[PDB]
Symmetry: C3
Subunit: 413 residues, 3 copies
């Protein structure tokens, strides 16, 4: 069965304390990967579910509260750019979508061992708070309620067509020669193009040059975007961090403030002409008019009224008229639609789960059930892959992909 | 007719300035009883409607702004625990759901005498504000936006199955022998069990021992619950107190703050797996996964989006597939469902009215009309009783029950 | 075609920098007229669209940030009361609905010239902020989140039946004799009655006597109303001003505060018995129970939940059972309904557009399309008039009316 197979991927990809996203392709600990993977471990061993998160904070979190996107636990030649490019166990210098508090809330509420639950939640609570504080300190200096990402890897959706025009401004002059390693594990046509990677590395070198100084990175990055996905996830995490606080009887401090200001911000990203949520390019000072599946994530946050949810429900159904499987990462009628190339079209299991949870909350039971059925069927037929063709259902990207197996286990719990 | 009969109960139960909930059974002034009863008096004599509330504050409200749940106006042997157990005219040392500002808002808006309206509203406004302030001072020291009740009588829903596990922790060692008086007026099978009353009194003695000190009561009570009902009622009252302020041109001070923070809090009580609002046990640090009719009360508050209201509408309809009359106080499929025993199943007229008002606001006209029709039919056939069997419609609890007659008059105005 | 004809009205009514609402009838610059008219100019010449707003601020805005309702650019005998009555280029001493930031947001987002866009938006941003600040300073001293208008011209809906009882209190003793000029350009039966104008002038003379002192005007005006229209427009403008700030990377200062407090306030105006939003009379301290088309404007603001939008959708459909064209300015079953007299029944193109945009946002596509079709058909058959008979579709009020032509061009863009 699906579940038995799912467990084996998690056990094979386990390195003891953390779980790699994929053998070789992703030989390190990733931030939002580890959060979703923790949910899967709840179906195998709770102790080890918590452990995934403890390892993430204990080895990942810097003194300023920043949680980086990769914790480079063990040497490897299989991944670029590795610790030596970042030049800092070693970690990357950027962050990823802060889905962790949401995952911590579920672990806390549902652990059968209530003494363990409380120990781990009290231990992680202030660390969560420091992470969110770093986000607003580093990425929201005008106190807007929205946070910027300074690198498209921080969205978790690396080559999303929303980032194309923002990335066009990143200078690519006199970059060191590098050899990519991802294309040894995955077909190149399924990964970002070199123009993309040149720009990904140019940003990393600007950041390393500026010594990963939050203030300077913000001032000088040629890439500054209010990602609808990162911010919807953050609004959701804030609401779950608030719940934790009240349940644990901790001082919620300024969490309420984050929530209230975040709600004004997240709903500002709505474009009434297009009937969709867009990420914003702050360098250009404009909305990025590109409908990606991150634009559904405010449903996960719970900020929209029913009428906006309705309009999103209608949009997903339209995408379903072309795509055999929901939910493709970009409008399949988009000129940028590429049904096999990463975040430019393929279906992803984690986004399916989030958007489904979201639609369920707003009463769209049939659509939420379609997203679940599509996810499970894709995984029944092609195993646990990083993403899938929305037209054909063909597995793409990483094989033995940990969060696919984790969410399969979680969603069928 | 129903209305003529309703008036007579109010006139018979009137003690001049206040109205008892029921002759003998409840021979004193109750807090949320008197608020709903005031609405009924609006259909007989407005002066006397206001008077109900004036008496409540003038004789009930302590120096710290606390409004207690019982004002022990006249000696009686018919009720236990009476003023001498509480040991403090005398009052109890605990509060009840703060529905009063909402009732004060209606009285103010609708009194045909506009000079009276303004006198009474200006007189009561600062007293209302002090009451709410006491709530946040005594019961929300971490400034969460949610307030705890420290005793299940404070919910107004004394033996709700949500309180069972919280109550299990209340020590019952070496309690004085007492004789219950409620079971002289009502069948025992319709009232709380002795295990319940032992625990109710143990909490009262801890509170009397700690001299009803808000700070110590909060720190030491073995019972600490965020009641969804108390807090939904409080959110609604806050919004109505804000309206009063603007209408009277009074400084709303921190009411906005209460409303904004309260809205974050009340919506945190939603459990997405169960599709329902739960009260929270802060001693255990967990949601209490028990669906009671208090979980519908956020509709009265107006905080949910339409999708949550939808899911609640679906839940009420399911309860209606078993129960002949809506709205039973607990899911009729609950293992704790007891169709005659107080707040563990019976239908209540005040909760019917609140939940109906709530569903009406969210567009569920048919369900709201069903709740009204059910309430009025129950009262047509069995008179004005405290609660009713949801299966058979048989009258239960107190006879000549004042808020049933009051709401009957109000709801058919 | 409609569009070609629309352009000619704007070019004929253009005085170079600003556009008059109507030749002769309205020979000056009006505040909310110029905002809607700017949207029309976007379909002809963007430079000139911006210019409309620049002229409004550069010549209109006082040192305290107040934006007045009329900028009296050029001498004329065609209008009363003109600059010499106000006694202050000259301007009036009162304001109008602050729809400007919303219009500025659209201009900014859509200007094909991105350098121009940024210049104009950065230039106008702090001026917008000062205008809103003046509103809260002058008109919200208790920091309610709602602002009062002190004169029914400030609503933009001069003789709305909601103002009748508030106006009844304005003293009309020993007023100077005046001659009205509006009735030279428009049938008197289509304009306000003399009892109205006596009261309009009495307020202007009290204000001129008190030297247009914000503090004294607020304390002494016999007319003080929380207009649902002005405040819904302001909530919408605040949300758009917030968007601008984030897009421009300007410090949003207290805009979030305005939005959060404004949302509590605007939703307090909802009357659950009537199923509608009412303006409030603060002199009487009561809701004004009169359903006008301003009561739909919270849909433009985006504050209601779907259930209130639903109830409003049902109300508009009822009004449509009597009225051949939506949306009449007052419930056609109202005893105050006058199908030709200004804001007491006629259909208006700007309110149609706003309420349609609003219903679209809440998923009421059919109703929004009806409002648009009705607007365009009214303008196809009777040209561009100030308002129209909802029963017959007959043109009323000003001829060659600028915002009708502007919105016709805009809405068919
Ligand atoms: Cl909603």
């Amino acid at each position: 069965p699906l579940r038995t197979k799912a467990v084996e991927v998690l056990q094979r990809n386990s390195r003891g304390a953390f779980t790699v996203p994929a053998h070789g392709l992703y030989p390190y600990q990733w931030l939002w990967d580890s959060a979703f993977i923790a949910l899967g471990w709840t179906q195998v061993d709770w102790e080890r579910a918590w452990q995934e998160l403890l390892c993430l904070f204990d080895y990942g979190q810097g003194p300023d509260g920043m949680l980086p996107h990769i914790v480079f636990h063990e040497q490897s030649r299989d991944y670029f750019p590795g610790p030596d490019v970042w030049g800092r166990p070693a970690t990357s210098g950027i962050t990823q979508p802060p889905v962790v508090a949401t995952v911590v809330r579920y672990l806390y509420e549902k652990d059968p061992d209530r003494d363990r639950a409380r120990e781990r939640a009290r231990y992680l609570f202030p660390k969560l708070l420091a992470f969110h504080r770093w986000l607003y300190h580093a990425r929201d200096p005008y106190r807007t309620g929205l946070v910027v990402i300074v690198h498209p890897w921080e969205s978790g959706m690396d080559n999303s067509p929303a980032w194309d025009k923002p990335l066009s401004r990143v200078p690519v002059e006199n970059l060191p020669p590098y050899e990519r390693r991802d294309v040894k594990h995955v077909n190149p046509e399924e990964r970002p193009r070199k123009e993309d990677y040149d720009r990904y590395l140019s940003l990393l070198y600007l950041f390393r040059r500026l010594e990963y100084d939050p203030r300077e990175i913000y001032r000088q990055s040629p890439f500054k975007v209010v990602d609808v996905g990162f911010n919807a996830i953050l609004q959701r995490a804030n609401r779950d961090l608030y719940a934790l606080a009240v349940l644990l009887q901790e001082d919620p401090y300024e969490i309420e403030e984050w929530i209230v200001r975040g709600e004004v911000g997240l709903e500002a990203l709505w474009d009434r002409e297009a009937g969709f949520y867009f990420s914003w390019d702050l360098v250009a000072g404009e909305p990025i008019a590109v409908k990606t599946s991150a634009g559904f994530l405010p449903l996960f946050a719970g900020t929209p009224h029913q009428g906006r949810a309705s309009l999103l429900a209608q949009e997903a159904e339209r995408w379903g008229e072309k795509a055999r499987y929901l939910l493709p990462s970009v409008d399949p009628t988009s000129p940028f639609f590429e049904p096999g190339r990463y975040w430019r079209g393929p279906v992803w299991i984690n986004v399916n789960w989030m958007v489904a949870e979201g639609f369920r909350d707003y009463g769209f039971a049939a659509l939420a059930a379609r997203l679940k059925a599509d996810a499970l069927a894709l995984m029944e037929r092609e195993g646990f892959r990083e993403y899938y063709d929305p037209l054909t259902g063909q597995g793409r990207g990483g094989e033995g992909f940990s969060w696919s197996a984790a969410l399969a286990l979680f969603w069928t719990r």
